[PDB]
Amino acid sequence: MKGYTVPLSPRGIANLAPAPPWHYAGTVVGVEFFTDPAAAAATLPEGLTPDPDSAGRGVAMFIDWQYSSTGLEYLDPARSQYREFLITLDAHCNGAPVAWCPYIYVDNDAAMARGWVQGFPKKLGAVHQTRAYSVGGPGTPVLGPGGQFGATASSAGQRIAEAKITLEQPVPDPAALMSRPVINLRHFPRLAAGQHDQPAVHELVMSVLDDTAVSDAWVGTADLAFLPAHGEELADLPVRRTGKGFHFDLAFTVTDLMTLADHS
Amino acid sequence: MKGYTVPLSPRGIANLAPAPPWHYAGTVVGVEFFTDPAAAAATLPEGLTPDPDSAGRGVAMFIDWQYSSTGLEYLDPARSQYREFLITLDAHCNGAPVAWCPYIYVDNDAAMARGWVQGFPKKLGAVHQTRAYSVGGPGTPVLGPGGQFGATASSAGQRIAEAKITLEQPVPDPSRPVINLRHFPRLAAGQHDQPAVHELVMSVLDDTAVSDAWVGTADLAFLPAHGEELADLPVRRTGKGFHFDLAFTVTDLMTLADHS
Amino acid sequence: MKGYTVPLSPRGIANLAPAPPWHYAGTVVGVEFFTDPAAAAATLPEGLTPDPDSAGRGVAMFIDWQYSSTGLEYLDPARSQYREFLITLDAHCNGAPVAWCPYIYVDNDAAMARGWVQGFPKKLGAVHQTRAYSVGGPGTPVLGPGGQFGATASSAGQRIAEAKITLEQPVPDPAALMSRPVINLRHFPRLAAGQHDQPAVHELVMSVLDDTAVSDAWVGTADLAFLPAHGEELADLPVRRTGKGFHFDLAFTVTDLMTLADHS
Amino acid sequence: MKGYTVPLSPRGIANLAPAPPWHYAGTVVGVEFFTDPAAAAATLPEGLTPDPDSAGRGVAMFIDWQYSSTGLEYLDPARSQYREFLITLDAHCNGAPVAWCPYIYVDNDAAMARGWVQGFPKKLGAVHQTRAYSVGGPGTPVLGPGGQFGATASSAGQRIAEAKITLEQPVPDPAALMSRPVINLRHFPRLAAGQHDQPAVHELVMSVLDDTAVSDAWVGTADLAFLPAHGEELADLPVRRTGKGFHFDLAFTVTDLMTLADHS
């Protein structure tokens, strides 16, 4: 049998995701927000410490992704396109600023599988963001000063996040938006009786992104709210204040992943 | 009892679609195709006749739409964004070349309702098209020569159309009006064959704009499916593939013939 | 061209719904509720009167439907099965008790089309109800005393209703559950400039059901809440108090519809 | 951090699936089928061998599931109800008859996660089956002689299986329907460079079902077809002949899993 993820199969096609490289091109609506430092700290895994300078700061990102591998998979958009909502929280790893990801939602099963392999704790959700069309007109915002963009995320039919940004000026240092590495947790439990508290995989990891590119980056103001929902804990990170709003394209390739600590 | 479409309500908010103006901005992946003239003619309503020059020609379009009205509704993409697959067939209306729309599919209930009001016979479906990102890289095609775009449409979990285009040249000067049929039946016993609304209409588009248009080669197939008839217009050969942005506003509709 | 609803076609197959008869078999989770009489009155169309005895009373129903016509269409569950959430409000039509339906949600486009033809103002939604399995065990409630059933409805990814019932005893008079006729409003607007306020169809109608049958009818206690949501007005009929909860099978055939008053 | 599957969280609620017990109640439309012995053998993992008596035989199952755990989770059908399509293939393990599961599809993210933990190689799909209603009438088949039931499965908008059964008589020995234990493969790859062919988890497992129960079991005739689809390999198991069709309720609890061989 062949394949990278399940299902393994005779021809290695049925698997949810093939082996890397995984290529990504996306458009991001992002919102800087600030929650209670203690609430953010409660989500951190062992190995990460509160950020001494910006504890409580986080970033909420709504992304329209397009994925591809080595065979022009982006020509099959029914499988390759997906929409994603995640938050990261400022933290430190041994004195270095990092971005811990506690929650993330996608509308695609292949994306969910790729995320689990990376340690992104992906669940299914419905994610939407306003789109900018270059033809212009009253059906689209301008990708420039004054342009307004909305974004929402739902899980199991429940709205969990709603955001709006208003662009003001270009980002001076676009590459700096990706300065903090994302930290994740690869986790796969055991089902054998007596071992439900002894996961087979449980390791802190740092996301490794090849050939990262950011373009058409804009910054402005933002409004954001997290909403309580049954079976979710996002709203346990209350939005006390919103920072800047961001809009940019993002691209990278995934071929690697750094294990920081293997907790068995 | 305020509102434009149902549900009517005390505040006029719950309705699937409010009154026009309806604004649209979209990106189109399309394929010119040719089917059997007799098959195309079989779909034509009363009032339309076969095209004496291009009978059998049609256009398949996959569109990523964004809608808005008078209140920045595009800030609510969960309701305002939708994806659409339709075909048009060359025909004549009183000697004038037109484009008849027999089938169209969308993934949004508000778009379905707006379409019914326009005479677009919209059903629900799953529609996807490759997207071009300006950042570039291996996760996206590049708009321009050699850029490849795929598109698909499904209905009730059944794939009904698959397409791919390869762009070759830009179009410097970016023509048939779309003809639709407003149709709303009666349920009163004895009147199931006497629709309350049954009228040929011409789509009216305000402030139409097309940008960044490209043409190239194309592959297209319609697939047989239960409860669908699209594949009864088999693709005997393809013409040009094309890619462009499209914008217009809807405020009006032209009644051509009332068959009720 | 052939067909009943659009699209009309050479074979009359592609249409969203064929001509009647339309057959229905369903399982209902229902909740009697009481809202503000003035709020219920605000939703009533011209021609209906507030109920002089039970103004403000309504019924919320979550239904798992199976539809069929003359050709065993229920063998195609991808098209024929759908789930439905609606409310009715007590009202009077010329001194006779009736049930006005202001809002209804389904997860199926064919059902939406059939609804519009009937005057049910259907929109898309996600509807779910707990199901009872004869095999029993910890994965199912019992269809009998003590059985608990939950139900929810969402629209555009927003939760608009959450309900729970606990069964106590059989319904004393099952047939009486369908005593109030449902009143609807067939409505189809015009798009020609200058006529956006002059609908082509605008007529009050009474639902006509053939061969109505109820079975396995139970009654008990109930909890219900409507939730505010963007683009919805259901929560403007707040649940001030809940009445009885109901669980029953329902079946009927649709071949007819009674026009009460034509207004445009 | 609390939780069984990802996401781990402060309160242990956001996780896709909590720790077992997992309770299941479902209604199965099943079809016995026969494919090419060599095609079935091509899907078998190491440790399984062709069945010396019935190589090529399989069972296609369409199931309407309801899940619960220790807190009446079936009162939240938006999360707890899901629909499932799978096939099993007759095989042998060390001379014992077993049922290997190469492919399986569900319409719920929690179900997909639970399956991965069990070694069920679940992907997202759309699955439907005709339902029998006690009220009867033209909208439902009879759960008895002559009752006809349809079932379908799609993946990424592509139909991959269509089936129909006609019931004839009760199953003589209902408990015998679950005689072959199911064999699965727990599999979780590595993303670290150089280790994309060295999965972290890769083990043959046998499904352990507690308190298995079958009821309302019927048998009859069947028709079945697998359809080719991009990104799938189900149709590489062509249906040369269909055997009997089955309709029954099924219930069990999952608390355990038996590791047969660790191939990591």
Ligand SMILES: *[C@H](/C=C/C=C/c1ccc([N+](=O)[O-])cc1)C(=O)O
């Ligand atoms: C699943 C998700 C891939 C991860 C996407 C992602 C989001 C945000 C950052 N970031 O650094 O802000 C990085 C990666 C998949 O389908 O791979």
Ligand SMILES: *[C@H](/C=C/C=C/c1ccc([N+](=O)[O-])cc1)C(=O)O
């Ligand atoms: C429903 C759809 C209305 C607009 C669709 C459309 C498609 C193609 C052309 N065309 O000129 O080729 C024009 C209009 C809605 O949501 O309004």
Ligand SMILES: *[C@H](/C=C/C=C/c1ccc([N+](=O)[O-])cc1)C(=O)O
């Ligand atoms: C659309 C809806 C059909 C109507 C269902 C219905 C609900 C409730 C009652 N009632 O008397 O309480 C009657 C009928 C369709 O798909 O037809």
Ligand SMILES: *[C@H](/C=C/C=C/c1ccc([N+](=O)[O-])cc1)C(=O)O
């Ligand atoms: C995922 C799936 C659970 C497994 C279901 C299943 C199907 C068939 C048999 N069988 O023995 O034929 C056993 C179990 C989940 O959501 O757990």
Ligand SMILES: [K+]
């Ligand atoms: K604009």
Ligand SMILES: [K+]
């Ligand atoms: K490229």
Ligand SMILES: [K+]
């Ligand atoms: K029970």
Ligand SMILES: [K+]
């Ligand atoms: K029957």
